[PDB]
Write a structure and sequence with these properties.
This is part of a larger assembly, with seven protein chains of seven kinds. Chain A contains three helices and no strands. With 85 residues, chain A is mainly α. With 80 residues, chain C is mostly helical. Chain C is elongated and about 85 Å long. Chain C starts with 6 loop residues before the first helix and ends in a 10-residue tail after the last helix. Chain E has 31 residues and is mainly alpha-helical. Helix content of chain E is 29%, strand content 0%. Chain E starts with 6 loop residues before the first helix and ends in a 16-residue tail after the last helix. By secondary structure, chain G is mainly β. Chain G has a single domain, classed as RNA polymerase II/Efflux pump adaptor protein, barrel-sandwich hybrid domain (OB fold (Dihydrolipoamide Acetyltransferase, E2P), Beta Barrel), CATH 2.40.50.100. In chain G, the strands form two sheets. Chain G has a four-stranded mixed sheet with strand order 1-6-7-3, with no helix packed on it. The longest helix of chain G is centred in the middle third of the chain and has 7 residues. Chain G is extended and about 65 Å long. The N and C termini of chain G lie far apart (64 Å). Classes of the chains: A mainly alpha (85), B alpha+beta (120), C mainly alpha (80), D mainly alpha (64), E mainly alpha (31), F little secondary structure (19), G mainly beta (101). Chains D and G meet through helix 1 and helix 2 of D and strand 6 and strand 7 of G. The structure holds magnesium ion (27 copies). The structure holds four RNA strands. Chain C: One of its GO terms (molecular function) is structural constituent of ribosome.
RNA sequence: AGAGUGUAGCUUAACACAAAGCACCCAACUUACACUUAGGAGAUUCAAUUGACGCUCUGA
RNA sequence: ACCUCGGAGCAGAACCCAACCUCCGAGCAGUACAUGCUAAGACUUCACCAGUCAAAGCGAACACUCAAUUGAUCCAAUAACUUGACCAACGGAACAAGUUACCCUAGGGAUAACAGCGCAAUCCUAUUCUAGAGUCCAUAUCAACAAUAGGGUUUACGACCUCGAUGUUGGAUCAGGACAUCCCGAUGGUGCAGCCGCUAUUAAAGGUUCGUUUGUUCAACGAUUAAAGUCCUACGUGAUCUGAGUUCAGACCGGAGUAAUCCAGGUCGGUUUCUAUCUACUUUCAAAUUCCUCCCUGUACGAAAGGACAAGAGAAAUAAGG
RNA sequence: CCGAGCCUGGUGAUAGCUGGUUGUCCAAGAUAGAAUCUUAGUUCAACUUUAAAUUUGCCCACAGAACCCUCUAAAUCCCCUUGUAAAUUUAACUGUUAGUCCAAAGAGGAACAGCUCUUUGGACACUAGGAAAAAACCUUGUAGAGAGAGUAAAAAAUUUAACACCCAUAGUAGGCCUAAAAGCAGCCACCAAUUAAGAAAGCGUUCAAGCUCAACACCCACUAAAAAAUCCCAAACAUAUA
RNA sequence: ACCCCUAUACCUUCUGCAUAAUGAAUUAACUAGAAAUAACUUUGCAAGGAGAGCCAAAGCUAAGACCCCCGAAACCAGACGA
């Protein structure tokens, strides 16, 4: 029932993102939390990498636009300055 | 002879009814693409295989983020039939340093800066 | 043997066609023009290649340790 | 695959069905003159130039 | 009798068939 | 070149009829 | 299978001597700083950048057949050919101090 | 009698240093023609933007 | 006939690339006599060998035209400078032909039922078309130019005469099957008075002869028959049998060749063995067809000549079972 | 066991031909050609492998790449940016190549199929799933264990021929050619009476005679094929919410 | 145990394909990659190296590390055979 899950904004595979996979499987009986699961560590790492990429690409494009705007302004300033004498 | 296909520009021109059908507007366009390969590069020309490799889409059903710029778009146009393109949506801000680790890309295409597994 | 097109096959085809039609739409609106795009990633692109060059140039035989050679004497380590 | 011209293509205006009726150059010099005229004129295609770039008075003089 | 088509080509032909418009009520049934 | 708009700029013997 | 054609496209750096194009017939005419060999091959006379342009064709008066063709043209007609140029990149030389006499 | 007007045949050539550039004709070569060479003739309709001398169409 | 070089069909547009084929051409010649010397940078027939262009400089003067127009090494001649192959099988052994059916060896291919499997050319069959034959009358019957459907055959270049193939094909034994029916059954039409016919529909239960070649390019002849069907089955079937051919070891004739020998020509003579391991099978059974004679009857029918059908009776032949 | 005996030696003759070539595990790894007494082979190149050095490689955007023949497309070359990480050079070797099928464009005397061949691309000689079994079609590739999950390609459709009822006088057998053509052997004109009929649209007579059709009333309805040889070949099913 | 479901023996050859063709009754034993120049790796010494000769414009010396098996019809020499 993947298509329905996508409509509800969940992953198509229940084994995807969500509390069923991402939460710890077990804990100590006394109440101490378990050491983190190896798969979950990997998932966290990949996600961090994706987020780092998102910010970097965003920054690059906005910086590119700013640089272009400055170039356009410089050209306009130059052309109006040359009107002297 | 089977050759590279050059695509007319007219197909990459969005009609008003297209703007109704898909939630986007020509003013304030989306900054980033989410691209997933949904179709194999087997039984497909070498140039398409190479462009898939460049975009980092070797593995199927994995989302990759790309700049929505003409040069990247040019590469996506060649392999458009192998891929699914959705705009990256940011309901909150783009992630800060404190919330960099705690992120999740949802199937809707929105990246959430807070992802604690508690229900609402 | 003649092959025929089923309803399922037609449905599968239209499903893919629907996806690619949406693909067209999202490629329709670029954020930057070609002129604005020029040289924005140049610095990063350069540095990335210097990283590749550094890796290539750094190729050299590994260090050889006296400890490694002497440790082979332990093959005849015995109790008294 | 063809692209239409970006301006008036040369020799287009003079192109008529009847060619025998049209007057022609009979001399090298006439064509030459017209050629320099064309060369000096600006063009939409790439060119070499782009890369390598008183009444009383009259009466008195007439009398003289 | 026609030349045998590639299956992908035949599928494309099948998908791209003229569909006539169907009114909600048949015109004959209407006064 | 054929694809370019400057195609057939050097066409000459449509202007003459050597018959 | 004579392997004749353009060897250097537009915007390519050439050195003096470099063969721009081999042709058999005059498809591309020599322009600025471009020599023509016996075999009709075009070669760079200077170090620079290769450009292709469309220029008005005026043949040498001694060239009988070309002059004949010219004299058969209508009054408004001008002939155009493709021309290969080399735009020189470096100055001929520089003046530098050798002796503070 | 009214209207339209206006440089040698042509040119929305003429800011000026200027009335210019193609047309045209004679002579030589050519059976001729053409090319070339060697020569010749040429004009702002008149008076202060305006008025009247020439031209074309409309009245008898 | 061809083998090397150049051009076109020929990659529609950088280069390269269309084998085989269809066409063309080349194996020079003319003018110089600085057609001297030297030297950056390049191109390149997809390698190499070869081949191509050329700035500047020295010395002169005021690096020719042509699409190809050609040949390595060795060696020989020569004081040197140079020169030497129709080495054309054109990357070229310094110089060597036929024939083998007396043949041999190492292999490959058929082997043997494919090697060419989704339709161009041609043939046959059926349908469509409705010109035309049929006294008039398309459709009793036949059918031109064509079209459609199914089944065969052939096809990439000497727009040369061939003759091919060859577990190729006869016969025996036993047959299995198809129907597109030769006979026997039942129908519709007729240019069906009746007997014979012509044509189509339906029918594969049963049956479908014995002999002989003077001439005949897949042919006859004699006598019969109810009829002497057309095909598929790896010639159906050679571990059941047997002619001929491929097809030869010997020999002769005609022709070819100096000969040895050959024939895509003719004629005579001429060796393939098998003890069945496996699969399959080894009294399905209990149902028969046909011809002729007689009756009807010499009837109906028909002007006569001639001459039925049903129903019945008798005799046979074959087949199956005793 | 004689188209040239046998034995021994030379002799481990030679064989570009046939056959064979022995532990374990991992990795990279496939189809431009040229010359050749050469196409059953070899040498060079191309591709492949390793190690080393160094900087660009690939993807590419404007600009740029012919006239002639009277036409000609998909495309190609070149190429900053960009997305990427590879490329070139150096040293050292071997091995592979008439590849097959599919899609597309073509070539072989102006042969739409077939055969042979060239080019572009894909797959195959590497995994699995699907199409009935299935090298080459579709889906899919990087490796293990699991008695978890989401998916990809993925099930052929179709059933077909009715048709009008009623009624018809007459200028004249309309003139010419014809034994005669008289509505229908042929040519010219094509009027005209009733209320309404064509100097007659199709049959039929040697020619006539006749049966329709159009005409007036009456008001009715009128809407395209099949066959073969051992024995047909999944079973089946129109009706519970993609 | 079988019944159920899944599964087209191995080797070798042909431009490519196996399911075609080749080889194998089975067991035991026997039965098939030999070396150089040049490079690479690791030492020694170093404008020199080497236990005469030889090499050397960082080389020289030493070591390690690459090149199969079976099969013709034949040819010749000397014997042996009516
Ligand atoms: Mg080369
Ligand atoms: Mg070649
Ligand atoms: Mg010079
Ligand atoms: Mg030869
Ligand atoms: Mg040769
Ligand atoms: Mg050659
Ligand atoms: Mg004999
Ligand atoms: Mg075989
Ligand atoms: Mg064989
Ligand atoms: Mg008739
Ligand atoms: Mg055959
Ligand atoms: Mg039988
Ligand atoms: Mg029948
Ligand atoms: Mg037979
Ligand atoms: Mg047998
Ligand atoms: Mg005898
Ligand atoms: Mg041997
Ligand atoms: Mg591997
Ligand atoms: Mg030779
Ligand atoms: Mg040979
Ligand atoms: Mg060989
Ligand atoms: Mg580039
Ligand atoms: Mg082939
Ligand atoms: Mg009527
Ligand atoms: Mg055996
Ligand atoms: Mg004796
Ligand atoms: Mg004796």
């Amino acid at each position: 029932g993947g298509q329905w899950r996508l409509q509800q904004g969940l992953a198509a595979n229940p084994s995807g993102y969500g509390p069923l996979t991402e939460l710890p499987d077990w804990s100590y009986a006394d109440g101490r939390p378990a050491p983190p699961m190896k798969g979950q560590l990997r998932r966290k790492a990949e996600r961090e990498t994706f987020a780092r990429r998102v910010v970097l690409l965003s920054q690059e494009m906005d910086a590119g636009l700013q640089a272009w705007q400055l170039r356009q302004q410089k050209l306009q300033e130059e052309q109006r300055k040359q009107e002297n004498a | 002879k089977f050759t590279r296909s050059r695509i007319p520009e007219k197909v990459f021109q969005a009609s008003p009814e297209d703007h109704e059908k898909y939630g986007g507007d020509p003013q304030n366009p989306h900054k980033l693409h989410i691209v997933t390969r949904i179709k194999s590069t087997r039984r497909r020309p070498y140039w398409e295989k190479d462009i898939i490799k460049m975009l980092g889409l070797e593995k199927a059903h994995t989302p990759q983020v790309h700049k929505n710029i003409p040069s990247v778009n040019a590469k996506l146009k060649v392999v458009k039939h192998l891929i699914r393109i959705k705009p990256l949506k940011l309901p909150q801000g783009l992630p800060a340093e404190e919330n960099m680790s705690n992120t999740c890309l949802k199937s809707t295409g929105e990246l959430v800066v807070q992802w604690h597994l508690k229900p609402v | 043997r003649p092959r025929f097109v089923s309803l399922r096959a037609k449905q599968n085809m239209i499903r893919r066609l629907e996806i690619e039609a949406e693909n067209h739409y999202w490629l329709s609106m670029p954020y930057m023009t070609r002129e604005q795009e020029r040289g924005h990633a140049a610095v990063r692109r350069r540095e990335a290649f210097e990283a590749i060059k550094a890796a290539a140039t750094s190729k050299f035989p590994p260090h050889r340790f006296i400890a490694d050679q002497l440790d082979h004497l332990n093959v005849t380590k015995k109790w008294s | 695959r063809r692209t239409p011209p970006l301006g008036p293509m040369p020799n287009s205006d003079i192109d008529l069905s009847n060619l025998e009726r049209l007057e022609k150059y009979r001399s090298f010099d006439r064509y030459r003159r017209r050629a320099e005229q064309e060369a000096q004129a600006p063009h939409w295609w790439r060119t070499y130039r782009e890369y390598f770039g008183r009444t009383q008075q009259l009466l008195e003089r007439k009398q003289a | 009798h026609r030349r045998v088509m590639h299956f992908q080509r035949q599928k494309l032909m099948a998908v791209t068939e003229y569909i006539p418009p169907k009114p909600a009520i048949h015109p004959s049934c209407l006064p | 070149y054929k694809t370019k708009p400057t195609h057939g700029i050097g066409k000459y013997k449509h202007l003459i009829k050597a018959e | 299978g004579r392997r004749q054609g353009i060897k250097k496209m537009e915007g390519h750096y050439v050195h003096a001597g470099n063969i721009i194009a081999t042709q058999r017939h005059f498809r591309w005419h020599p322009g600025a700083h471009v020599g023509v060999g016996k075999n009709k091959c075009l070669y760079a006379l200077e170090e620079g950048i290769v450009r292709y342009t469309k220029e008005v064709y005026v043949p040498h008066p001694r060239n009988t057949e070309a002059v004949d063709l010219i004299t058969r043209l209508p009054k408004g007609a001008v002939l155009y050919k493709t021309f290969v140029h080399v735009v020189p990149a470096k100055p001929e030389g520089t003046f530098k101090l050798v002796a503070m006499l």
